[model samples]
Target: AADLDTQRSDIATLLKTSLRKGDTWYLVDSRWFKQWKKYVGFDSWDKYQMGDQNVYPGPIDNSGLLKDGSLKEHLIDELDYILLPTEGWNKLVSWYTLMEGQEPIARKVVEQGMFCKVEVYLTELKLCENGNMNNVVTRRFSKADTIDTIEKEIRKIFSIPDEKETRLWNKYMSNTFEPLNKPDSTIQDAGLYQGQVLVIEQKNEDTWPR
Candidate 1:
């Protein structure tokens, strides 16, 4: 009863298909995701159909579901690495009229879905003197962008006025860095993706030798 009291609801809430994994990311059930979009009355799903990068219905959090007897029909199946609720959750909601105070949760479903966007950041590593990689800047471009274009932006952002010979390196790990030497190559062609750190080093230093 003590546990139940803390879990009592003044408002109805939808159960998360899963939990937030601190990374602001979730691998969802594709079928369930569609059901969620429809239930929320979201119209932006079409933008993601061709698969650009990713899109979210709303921020996932612990606020949606409680530990009470809210939805008794479903059970969560837990494996060591993942946890997910049983299917048919959407069906049960529509079959019965919602209880009072439950409308906000549905409104939450819809209202929250009306919002969304994306961004990327690039890091400029000051390798030799600083012995650390902390020069950061926000820049995002298409994978089809050429290295020449990318370098131009980096020079602009970092305010390097002179045309010094520089090289781009990908941080593979702490002990490894891969050189991206072709100015004619596309970012995708050079195997770069969002969130990887890039280092701009002088060409003749040989400090980060292959």
Candidate 2:
């Protein structure tokens, strides 16, 4: 029993030392997602949003279909859904300053602290049709693993060293940074929801906006 306790203490100490000093971690944030999506494009976005479908080019597709279609079947192409670099901060500025039209509602929302929230959507990359498909991927956390436990598991699995893991940990840390600073204003609760997509809403209850 003493030996077991000692071993546990040693493991805990090692993990703490590894994590504290910044090792074996990779930062994943909205910025990373923005750049990644931009580089990868809409097909990858679609795959990320809609997981593993046997139906290739399903009956309904793309943002263009939403405007005229019913709410149930069609995927809405709201500006909110478009993952932009820097949370579209510059675009909002351009729209207000350069565009002749009135300032858009989204711009207002972003300015008024009703901005889109970033959540870490993680999955194993799988190859489909000789392409990297994040769809049909397994979630890192589910009902079985809470956020805290998941973080610990990630640290362990990555074997986070004393130095190398800092970046990864920082990235993960960034996702929840807003919530941490402004708990009431931001959505701090974390858990697993069925289906593949992790949608972080701004002001809307229906995560899927049309």
Candidate 3:
């Protein structure tokens, strides 16, 4: 069997077994506070205070299933969310087939005979001062000023030098950061500005190239 094919098949089986019937899982696409609050089940940001913070918004809802085999209905009414399937998730893994230019490695650890490990890192940018937690808004500012502030804040939070911080920003934040352009992007643009970045690391043991 092709190593990649085997990996994909194994992953599909694993996901099916892990998920229960009528359950729903969502891949968050929007960083809007209101959308986050609704789907994540968090009433306010205060709940995520510094010390002893509460992670109220736990795992996503995976109960909404569509007949066409696509999760189109589960999308937030005015917001954006991506619903992933066994195949979609598998494709993501396949993309990184050549980890270090070597055909990937396959290990049979989980229920599946062969598998790979995937790690991900994420970062989000939000206005420093915002009282309305559920409101979806973007505060306008000069690009240079905004970038400088964001970089400084990120450096402070991660305890890194400016150069290292810039490298990290380019690797993780540059591609996705953009001014609000779509209607939903401007839904609540007044007091807050938010942006999110997701990094999905996966061991590509799948047969097909992502």
After best superposition, candidate 2 residue 99: deviation in angstroms? Answer: 69
Query: CA lDDT, every prediction?
Result: 0.41, 0.27, 0.31
lDDT of 1 by residue, 1-210 (tens): 112111112101323333222212212233334433444333444433322223322222222333353211232322111122222233333332233454312201111134321111222233221123665654655554677777777666665555456777777888587877899997758877766666665444444323
lDDT of model 3 at residue 74?
42
Q: State candidate 2's TM-score.
A: 0.17
Error of 3 at 126 (Å): 5.4
Against the correct fold, how does model 1 do in TM-score?
Answer: 0.36
Per-residue lDDT tens digits for candidate 2, residues 102-124, read: 22222111111443322223222
The segments of candidate 3 whose C-alpha lies over 4 angstroms from its true place after superposition are 1-5, 17-126, 129-210
User: Which portions of model 1 show Cα errors greater than 4 Å?
Assistant: 1-132, 203-210
Highest lDDT against the true fold, candidate: 1
Each prediction's TM-score versus the true structure:
0.36, 0.17, 0.19
Residue clash pairs of candidate 2: 23-165, 24-164, 24-165, 25-165, 25-168, 26-168, 27-168, 27-171, 28-171
Better of 2 and 3 by lDDT: 3
Question: What's the lDDT for residue 97 in model 3?
Answer: 26
Worst 10-residue lDDT window, candidate 2: 124-133
